[PDB]
Amino acid sequence: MEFQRVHQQLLQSHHLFEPLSPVQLQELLASSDLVNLDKGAYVFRQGEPAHAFYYLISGCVKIYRLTPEGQEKILEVTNERNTFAEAMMFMDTPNYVATAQAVVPSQLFRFSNKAYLRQLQDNTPLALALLAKLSTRLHQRIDEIETLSL
Amino acid sequence: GSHMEFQRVHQQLLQSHHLFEPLSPVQLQELLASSDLVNLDKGAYVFRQGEPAHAFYYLISGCVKIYRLTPILEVTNERNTFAEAMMFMDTPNYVATAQAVVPSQLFRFSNKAYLRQLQDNTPLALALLAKLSTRLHQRIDEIETLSL
Prior knowledge:
The structure is a homodimer.
Chain A: H1 3-11, H2 22-30, E1 33-37, E2 42-44, E3 52-58, E4 60-66, E5 72-79, E6 83-84, E7 99-102, E8 106-112, H3 113-120, H4 124-137
Antiparallel strand pairs in A: 1-8, 2-7, 3-6, 3-8, 4-5, 4-7
Helix pairs in contact in A: 1-2
PDB class: transcription regulator
Keywords: beta barrel, dimerization helix, transcription regulator
Assembly: dimeric
């Protein structure tokens, strides 16, 4: 059962899991899936139901939308020990808006949106942190600021 | 106070709005200790574009028009708040002008005291996250990252 110690250890450094207590982190890991991928394999495809975000244990993932004429528009390249797709929880959209593909053999933790948000419901510090993040992401929207209400 | 005139008078009204309804008795008390009721004449300014942002408002009666300047935003309906978005953007000064266009009555609330309460209120922090979520539900074909 030693593996829980080492995984708590690397995850606790990351800002998405940091404000979580040891107890909450354990519970999040308990509902996660381990995901193994070859180079070229998809983590998820654009238009698929978005129910999970990912921590990249090892490897490298590119994120892009394919256009009507076949070409990739690239969103990001994610390096190991980083998360991706967590923004999906705070979009009013059912489906992944991009595709994520491993560019080398990779290994991930897939965390449920629903399980993470369950922890959030009893972690005010974490809620406030995400509120700060969402807020910076919606202040690069301060050229066409349409309202000062919520 | 002690009678706590202010909260006992105004709590029923405020508790009908989503920004204050989740606040516990004590949290509402602490918010209100730093709140005021303001009567504005036709055409006076609640605040001006470019002015420091230390308060947000609830329009009780009357009419407030909110608009930006040029190199057109919203007519605040009675029973609605405004300027609460200033708490959740990184600029410390107001980004627009609010002017009463008839004799208006408003609540003026301290941003500092409000954010203080938010620090101990997860249901409120969640509800604000859902409100920001609907705003981020812009970036239509304009989404540039899936990270936060």
